[PDB]
């Protein structure tokens, strides 16, 4: 599926991003959260949260943020091992049926904000290559998510 130069060309633009790991991934859930209020109702912290400026300064938010970031961490280091990822992907899907009951399509729309955030960070440096890399890992993201899902009695 992701081939060498894909893989690597990932890999080169996330450590690019998680050099302020926690700026990126913050801005990113506050977009999600802001052009998506419904996904907001998982959580208990924020549910009742409108301003942007203050769901940046949320705790739940930010370690969100984080815990997202070191999730995708783990999948974006090692895409070389097909294995890692399918499990780091079942513990996280499992997780968020189960655990939190999230309905599947808030990863669809999480993925698409992740995409248009990296799009506009790195805008000088995202040729069609590199745009296909990234559509593939979206894609497998959800694939692996929603096979959990299923797994699980979704
Ligand atoms: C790439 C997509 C995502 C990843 C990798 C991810 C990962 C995680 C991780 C690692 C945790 C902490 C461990 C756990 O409690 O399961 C967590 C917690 C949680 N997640 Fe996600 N998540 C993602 C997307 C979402 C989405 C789309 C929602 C709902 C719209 C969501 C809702 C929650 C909730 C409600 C918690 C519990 C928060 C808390 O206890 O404060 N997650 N997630
Ligand atoms: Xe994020
Ligand atoms: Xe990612
Ligand atoms: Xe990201
Ligand atoms: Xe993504």
Same mark, same amino acid.
């Given at each position: 599926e992701l081939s060498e130069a894909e893989r690597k060309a990932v890999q080169a633009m996330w450590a690019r991003l998680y050099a302020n790991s926690e700026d990126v991934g913050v801005a990113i859930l506050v977009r999600f959260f802001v052009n998506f209020? =419904?996904?907001?109702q998982y959580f208990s912290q924020?549910?009742?949260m409108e301003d942007p400026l203050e769901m940046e300064r949320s705790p739940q938010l930010r370690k969100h943020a984080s815990r997202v970031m070191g999730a995708l961490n783990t999948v974006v280091e090692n895409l070389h091992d097909p294995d890692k990822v399918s =499990?780091?992907?079942?513990?996280?899907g499992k997780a968020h049926a189960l655990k939190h009951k999230v309905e599947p399509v808030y990863f669809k729309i999480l993925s698409g904000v992740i995409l248009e955030v990296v799009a506009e960070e790195f805008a000088?440096?995202?040729p069609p290559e590199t745009?296909?890399?990234?559509?593939?890992l979206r894609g497998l993201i959800y694939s692996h998510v929603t096979a959990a899902?299923?797994?699980v009695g979704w």
């Open positions: 209020p =419904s996904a907001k924020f549910k009742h =499990s780091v992907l079942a513990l996280v000088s440096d995202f745009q296909r890399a990234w559509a593939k899902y299923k797994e």
